[PDB]
Swiss-Prot record, chain C:
Transmembrane annotation, as ranges: none
Modified residues (Phosphoserine): 27, 105
PTM notes: O-GlcNAcylated by OGT upon glucose sufficiency, promoting interaction with small GTPases Rag (RagA/RRAGA, RagB/RRAGB, RagC/RRAGC and/or RagD/RRAGD) and subsequent recruitment of mTORC1 to lysosomal membranes, leading to activation of the mTORC1 complex. Acetylation is decreased in response to fasting.
Subcellular location: Lysosome membrane; Cytoplasm; Cytoplasmic granule
Stated family: Belongs to the WD repeat RAPTOR family.
Name listed for the protein in its UniProt record: Regulatory-associated protein of mTOR
Gene: RPTOR
Result, substituting residue 564 to E: In alphax3 mutant; abolished interaction with GTP-bound RRAGA and recruitment to lysosomes
Part of the full-length chain shown: 18 to 686 of 1335
Function (record text): Component of the mechanistic target of rapamycin complex 1 (mTORC1), an evolutionarily conserved central nutrient sensor that stimulates anabolic reactions and macromolecule biosynthesis to promote cellular biomass generation and growth. In response to nutrients, growth factors or amino acids, mTORC1 is recruited to the lysosome membrane and promotes protein, lipid and nucleotide synthesis by phosphorylating several substrates, such as ribosomal protein S6 kinase (RPS6KB1 and RPS6KB2) and EIF4EBP1 (4E-BP1).
Subunit structure: Part of the mechanistic target of rapamycin complex 1 (mTORC1) which contains MTOR, MLST8 and RPTOR. mTORC1 associates with AKT1S1/PRAS40, which inhibits its activity. mTORC1 associates with DEPTOR, which regulates its activity. mTORC1 binds to and is inhibited by FKBP12-rapamycin. Forms a complex with MTOR under both leucine-rich and -poor conditions. Interacts with (via TOS motifs) EIF4EBP1 and RPS6KB1; interaction is independent of its association with MTOR.
Result after altering residue 602 to A: In alphax3 mutant; abolished interaction with GTP-bound RRAGA and recruitment to lysosomes
From Swiss-Prot, chain D:
Post-translational modification, as annotated: Autophosphorylates when part of mTORC1 or mTORC2. Phosphorylation in the kinase domain modulates the interactions of MTOR with RPTOR and AKT1S1/PRAS40 and leads to increased intrinsic mTORC1 kinase activity.
Domain notes: The kinase domain (PI3K/PI4K) is intrinsically active but has a highly restricted catalytic center. The FAT domain forms three discontinuous subdomains of alpha-helical TPR repeats plus a single subdomain of HEAT repeats. The four domains pack sequentially to form a C-shaped a-solenoid that clamps onto the kinase domain.
Subunit structure: Part of the mechanistic target of rapamycin complex 1 (mTORC1) which contains MTOR, MLST8 and RPTOR. The mTORC1 complex is a 1 Md obligate dimer of two stoichiometric heterotetramers with overall dimensions of 290 A x 210 A x 135 A. It has a rhomboid shape and a central cavity, the dimeric interfaces are formed by interlocking interactions between the two MTOR and the two RPTOR subunits.
Tissue note: Expressed in numerous tissues, with highest levels in testis.
Covered residues, full protein: 617 to 704 of 2549
Intracellular or extracellular location(s): Lysosome membrane; Endoplasmic reticulum membrane; Golgi apparatus membrane; Cell membrane
Biological role stated in the UniProt entry: Serine/threonine protein kinase which is a central regulator of cellular metabolism, growth and survival in response to hormones, growth factors, nutrients, energy and stress signals. MTOR directly or indirectly regulates the phosphorylation of at least 800 proteins. Functions as part of 2 structurally and functionally distinct signaling complexes mTORC1 and mTORC2 (mTOR complex 1 and 2).
Sequence ranges of the HEAT repeats: 18-57
Protein name: Serine/threonine-protein kinase mTOR
Organism: Homo sapiens (Human)
Family statement drawn from the similarity comment of this UniProt entry: Belongs to the PI3/PI4-kinase family.
UniProtKB/Swiss-Prot annotation, chain E:
Distribution of this protein across tissues and organs: Highly expressed in skeletal muscle, and in a lesser extent in brain, lung, small intestine, kidney and placenta.
Organism the protein comes from: Homo sapiens (Human)
Quaternary structure (record): Part of the mechanistic target of rapamycin complex 1 (mTORC1) which contains MTOR, MLST8 and RPTOR. mTORC1 associates with AKT1S1/PRAS40, which inhibits its activity. mTORC1 associates with DEPTOR, which regulates its activity. mTORC1 binds to and is inhibited by FKBP12-rapamycin. Forms a complex with MTOR under both leucine-rich and -poor conditions. Interacts with (via TOS motifs) EIF4EBP1 and RPS6KB1; interaction is independent of its association with MTOR. (Microbial infection) Interacts with vaccinia virus protein F17; this interaction dysregulates mTOR.
Name of the protein described by the UniProt record: Regulatory-associated protein of mTOR
Family the UniProt entry places it in: Belongs to the WD repeat RAPTOR family.
Phosphoserine, modified sites: 30
Range of the intact protein held here: 807 to 840 of 1335
Length: 79, 363, 653, 78, 34
């Protein structure tokens, strides 16, 4: 919410994706962290979208806020 | 005031500056897909030239094979073979049927647009080597050019059209020179340059009768022009218009069905009138070298430059295919008003009064 | 092999006129034009400094923050200091907007504020008025939407309702609040805005608001920074930007750079060749770049293009947002901006500062010549690298507003004009972008230059622009830029490629525009055009002929000049031109010449019959494109003699 | 093993690296490659891809979009 | 002179190309009804 996290996108996103496999309990918290990060990255998150989508389908992760944010990013609307 | 129309010419011209300029054009790109497909077509062309040249060295065998027999709605007036792509345009008085001789299917059907009195006499294939077009000169004078004539995803498209002149009309395309020489009932042989879209030279024929046929020589100026009275003039366009006429030998009295010239440096004008007698002339001689008499009542004739077969016709359904020396090869038993050889393969089309199109082949 | 024969063959009837249709491209809705130009006519400086007194709400630390408008109030004594700060503050604002009526209010009453605001509203009823509020000396604003002022005796803090404060000020206005809980004012302002909108059934978008802090946040108490931290940022950005740079951890990278060297930095804020003016110029580019990349195009032109002073305030607001963020402070704006503090361009600003004031020890002490920054050079290098692979419609280049800033000097003007042309070449989408960023009034100002090296570059740039937006013909006549091009068209040494573009530019200015036809006629275009009518370039011959045809389009004066010069006679040569574009252009001009006879003397009729028979010998022509214009040309002849052609038509019936 | 080899293959087959179509193709492939080099979970594949982006490609890597990817890569776990 | 230019427009009216014949016919018909 307060700091800039663009620099450290890989250092976080890759452990998160890995956390969403190895443990289903953290899946909720981690997805909430991911959506917030996505909101902060914006168009810079476009790179990671293919890989994360792959991990979501593997465990049917259907987050409301995240799907909205991706939809907005692909559309290009800013809010 | 609403009748005042304004062309989009001044606006279309301004589009030149919207497009980029500094960058390399698409044609200069050696690795572009259009150039690769063009180089692939030229690779296919050089193969078809080589393979056809190899068949000529093996001689010409008897030709009796019928690849197909279809029927058109109209009478076949003029036939041409596309040099490389198998597209055999068989035009009619009020249409241009585009047939094929590998699938064996009707590919397209145009309407030329000309009135009922007029008739499409002559036809050519412009830019036959690649991105070919179809010139369609009408007998009254109208010339017009058609693109995308046997395509899957495309329709008829008339590129350009302009009233020429003003027998019917005769044409001799010269791909390398870029010129086009309309002629017919008039006493003039115009030379329309297609790069400048203007008539360059208007050579006077010097003959009362109509110019029934007209054939020229590549890499030289040797405009041969048969005439309805019988004579066969030859003109050189390099000299002055008054001096353009070189020879005027007359040894016939009938319409010249097809005064055809060979592409060799040893040019031989094989002229066959309605009488049906061949007289092989030369451009450098005043009289005929060889003489032949084939059919009494000739109706239409065709020749091939690569193979010297004088494909004759007959009222009694015969198709005499003799040599220039006059030897008998075949007499294929079925107004045969259209025969047409390929520029490369020894294929011979035939077309009787009945609207039936064939395509023969030498095994 | 049999391939050299194939490649060396003319492809007949395969050219632009054949493949593409002869049709004009539909002009897009050019929205780049500014709707209106605002002018900040007057400024209200409400200063509640309360010098010599401390507000009860905030228990100030013993050092606290003393500097106000870069003036220690306790040094000068209470009354003089308050007058001095008001004077300096006016000067500071006069750096950005020197032509505005300033009226200070120093610890004002309520009536005093009422009479002040109502007078400034009377002066500029329809124009923006700035309201500056500095509440460092009064208690923090209340939740009920109130702001504190004094009583006549300065014995009681009187509250002032934001509703009443926004009553006296009008619709077009901008509000700057520099106080502790400044968010409360902005919230309550929008409330009273909504409350007024509810009352209107049975002034929101117009009113802009900037606030130093969020309602919860407090202003920093740090002795190093000035107390007037927000106002200083808005009004002296470079000054605090260097002082803040010297407070960060990044000073270790430049040892021997204290605040004392920053005080004694040489130069001024105007002279861009000095060290101080260099930074100000760089800063203006960087801030305008961040804004264009982050904000949506609509809101950018609203704030950064409408009027200069607002654009300057928001430019400096972005710097305030960055600095105050580092002290748990968040500035607030009424049109909410997305956070720009972490933009990449900010890193470039640090390096630019670092290199600029690493030389200061040698400039002050050794007296070394200040070498200019490579910043603008390197930014053009980045734009050039982008152009190499810029064919695709990818994200636009960040540096586009920097290219604009580079055009203002001469040092890099040649390189920028080149690159800008290459960019416009890419396509009409790019020309639209360059018009939206606001290149037009600067490219037009360069037409006042006399540097002949610029002539080929400006001709190119203007041809691309006028190809898209033909309405700019209005502007070129106003500024007498058509004379600049006339000179290029009468220069034999100028290549025929650039002279061709020049003839097109003139053919657009003249196109269906009587003011431009009358202006180019007086500039002797027809005589100049005929001098170039027999050039060895088929593009020039075509357009020069269209240009000639357009100038006498429904304008008999240009026809008479053509009759004196005898142009119609010289045009018959083009009727036998090889290139059918030229023949067509020739038919166009000869047709437009006939069409505007307007029942002149008999001479005209004999000339029209001479032009008729010369056109009547273009029937047997190969190109139908020419034959089509031949009809349109003979249409003009029929329209002129409609009564005569009716006699011929009725005869053969 | 397929991803790791297909990466080595494409990076080798782009040694022929003016035609706009080829540039747009190289730009597309190299954008996909950079995405794999940033986003692939298996850090061996990410290392191979990054190592394969040699001097040859530096004309393309210097583009803004490609440089924004590379910056993220300076904060890799490995 | 007008006889000659009307005969010219007759040639453009009977043009092989459709676009030229169409535009020539419009302009030629806009005379007839006057």
């Amino acid at each position: 919410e307060s700091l800039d996290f663009t620099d450290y996108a890989s250092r976080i996103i890759h452990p998160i994706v890995r956390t969403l496999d190895q443990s289903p309990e953290l899946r909720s918290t981690a997805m909430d962290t991911l959506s917030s990060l996505v909101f902060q990255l914006g168009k810079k998150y476009q790179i990671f979208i293919p890989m994360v989508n792959k991990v979501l389908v593997r465990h049917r992760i259907n987050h409301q806020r995240y799907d909205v944010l991706i939809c907005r990013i692909v559309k290009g609307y800013t809010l | 005031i609403s009748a005042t129309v304004q062309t989009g010419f001044c606006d279309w011209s301004a589009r030149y500056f919207a497009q980029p300029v500094m960058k390399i054009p698409e044609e200069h790109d050696l690795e572009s897909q259009i150039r690769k497909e063009r180089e692939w077509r030229f690779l296919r062309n050089s193969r078809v030239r080589r393979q056809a040249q190899q068949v000529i060295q093996k001689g010409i065998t008897r030709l009796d094979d019928q690849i197909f027999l279809n029927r058109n709605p109209g009478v076949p007036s003029v036939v041409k073979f596309h040099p490389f792509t198998p597209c055999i345009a068989v035009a009619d008085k009020d249409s241009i049927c585009f047939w094929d001789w590998e699938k064996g299917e009707k590919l397209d059907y145009f309407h030329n647009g000309n009135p009922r009195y007029t008739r499409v006499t002559a036809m050519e294939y412009l830019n036959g080597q690649d991105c070919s077009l179809l010139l369609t000169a009408t007998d009254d004078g109208a010339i017009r050019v058609w693109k995308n004539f046997a395509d899957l995803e495309k329709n008829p498209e008339m590129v350009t059209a302009w009233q020429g002149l003003s027998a019917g009309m005769v044409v001799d395309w010269e791909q390398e020179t870029g010129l086009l020489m309309s002629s017919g009932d008039v006493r003039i042989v115009r030379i329309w340059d297609t790069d400048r879209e203007m008539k360059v030279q208007d050579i006077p024929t010097g003959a009362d009768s109509c110019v029934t046929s007209l054939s020229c020589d590549s890499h030289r100026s040797l405009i041969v022009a048969g005439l309805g009275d019988g004579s066969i003039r030859v003109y050189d366009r390099r000299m002055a218009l008054s001096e353009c006429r070189v020879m005027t030998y007359r040894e016939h009295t009938a319409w010249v069905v097809k005064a055809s010239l060979q592409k060799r440096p040893d040019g031989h004008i094989v002229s066959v009138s309605v009488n049906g007698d061949v007289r092989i002339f030369d451009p450098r001689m005043p009289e005929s070298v060889n003489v032949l008499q084939i059919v009494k009542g000739l109706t239409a004739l065709d020749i091939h430059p690569q193979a010297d077969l004088i494909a004759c016709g007959s009222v009694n359904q015969f198709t005499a295919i003799y040599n220039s020396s006059g030897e008998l090869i075949n007499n294929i038993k079925y107004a045969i008003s259209c025969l047409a050889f390929h520029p490369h393969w020894p294929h011979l089309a035939v077309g009787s009064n009945d609207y039936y199109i064939s395509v023969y082949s030498v095994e | 092999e049999a391939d050299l024969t194939d490649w060396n063959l003319p492809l007949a009837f395969m050219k632009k006129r054949h493949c593409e249709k002869i049709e004009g491209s539909k002009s897009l809705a050019q929205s780049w034009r500014m709707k209106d130009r605002m002018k900040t006519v007057s400024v209200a400086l409400v200063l509640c400094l309360n010098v010599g007194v401390d507000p009860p709400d905030v228990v100030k630390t013993t050092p606290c923050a003393r500097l106000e408008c870069w003036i220690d109030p306790l040094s000068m004594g209470p009354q003089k200091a308050l007058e001095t700060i008001g004077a300096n503050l006016q000067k500071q604002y006069e750096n950005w907007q020197p032509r505005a009526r300033y009226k200070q209010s120093l610890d004002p009453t309520v009536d005093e504020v009422k009479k002040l605001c109502t007078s400034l509203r009377r002066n500029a009823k329809e124009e923006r008025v700035l309201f500056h509020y500095n509440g460092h000396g009064v208690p923090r604003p209340t939740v009920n939407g109130e702001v504190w002022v004094f009583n006549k005796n300065y014995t009681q803090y009187i509250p002032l309702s934001i509703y009443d404060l926004q009553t006296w000020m009008g619709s077009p206005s901008i509000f700057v609040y520099d106080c502790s809980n400044a968010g409360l004012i902005v919230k309550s302002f929008k409330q009273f805005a909504l409350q007024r909108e509810q009352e209107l059934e049975v002034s929101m978008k117009n009113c802009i608001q900037l606030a130093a802090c969020e309602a919860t946040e407090l202003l920093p108490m740090i002795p190093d920074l000035p107390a007037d931290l927000f106002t200083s940022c808005l009004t002296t950005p470079i000054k605090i930007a260097l002082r803040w740079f010297c407070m960060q951890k990044c000073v270790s990278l430049v040892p021997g750079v204290t605040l004392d060297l920053i005080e004694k930095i040489p130069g001024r804020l105007n002279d861009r060749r000095t060290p101080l003016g260099e930074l100000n110029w760089i800063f203006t580019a960087i801030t305008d770049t961040i804004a264009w990349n982050v904000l949506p195009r609509d809101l950018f032109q609203k704030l950064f293009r409408q009027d200069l002073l607002v654009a300057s305030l928001f430019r400096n607001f972005l710097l305030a947002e960055r600095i105050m963020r580092s002290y748990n402070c968040t500035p607030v704006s009424s049109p909410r901006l997305p956070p720009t503090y972490m933009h990449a361009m900010w890193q470039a600003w640090d390096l630019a500062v670092d290199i600029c004031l690493s030389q200061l020890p040698t400039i002050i002490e050794e007296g070394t010549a200040f070498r200019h920054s490579p910043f603008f050079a390197e930014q053009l290098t980045a734009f050039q690298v982008w152009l190499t692979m810029g064919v695709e419609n990818r994200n636009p280049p960040e540096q586009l507003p920097i290219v604009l800033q580079v055009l203002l000097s001469q040092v890099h003007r040649l390189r920028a004009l080149d690159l800008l042309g290459r960019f416009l070449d890419l396509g009409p989408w790019a020309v639209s972008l360059a018009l939206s960023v606001g290149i037009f009034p600067y490219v037009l100002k360069l037409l006042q230059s006399s540097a002949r090296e610029l002539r080929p570059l400006l001709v190119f740039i203007w041809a691309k622009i006028l190809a898209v937006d033909s309405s700019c013909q209005a502007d070129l006549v106003k500024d007498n830029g058509h004379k600049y091009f006339l000179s290029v068209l009468a220069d034999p040494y100028m290549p025929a490629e650039h002279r061709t573009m020049t003839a097109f530019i003139l053919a657009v200015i003249v196109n269906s525009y009587h003011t431009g036809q009358e202006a180019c006629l007086q500039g002797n275009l027809i005589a100049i055009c005929l001098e170039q009518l027999n050039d060895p370039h088929p593009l020039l011959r075509q357009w020069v002929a269209i240009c000639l045809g357009r100038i006498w389009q429904n304008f008999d004066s240009a026809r008479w000049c053509g009759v004196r010069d005898s142009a119609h006679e010289k045009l018959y040569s083009l009727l036998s031109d090889p290139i059918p574009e030229v023949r067509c252009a020739a038919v166009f001009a000869l047709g437009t010449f006939v069409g505007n006879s307007a029942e002149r003397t008999d001479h005209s009729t004999t000339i029209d019959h001479n032009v008729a028979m010369m056109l009547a010998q273009l029937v047997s022509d190969g190109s139908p494109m020419v034959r089509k214009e031949l009809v349109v040309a003979l249409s003009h002849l029929v329209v002129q003699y409609e009564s005569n052609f009716c006699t011929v038509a009725l005869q053969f019936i | 093993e397929i991803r790791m080899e297909a990466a080595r293959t494409c990076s080798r087959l782009l040694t022929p690296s003016v035609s706009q179509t080829a540039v747009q193709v190289v730009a597309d492939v190299l954008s996909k490659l950079l995405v794999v080099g940033i986003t692939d979970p298996d850090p061996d594949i990410r290392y191979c891809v990054l190592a394969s982006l040699d001097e040859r490609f530096d004309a393309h890597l210097a583009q803004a979009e490609n440089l924004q990817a590379l910056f993220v890569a300076l904060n890799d776990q490995v | 002179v007008y006889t000659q230019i009307w005969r010219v427009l007759l040639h453009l009216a009977a043009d092989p190309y459709p676009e030229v014949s169409d535009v020539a016919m419009k302009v030629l018909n806009s005379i007839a009804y006057k």
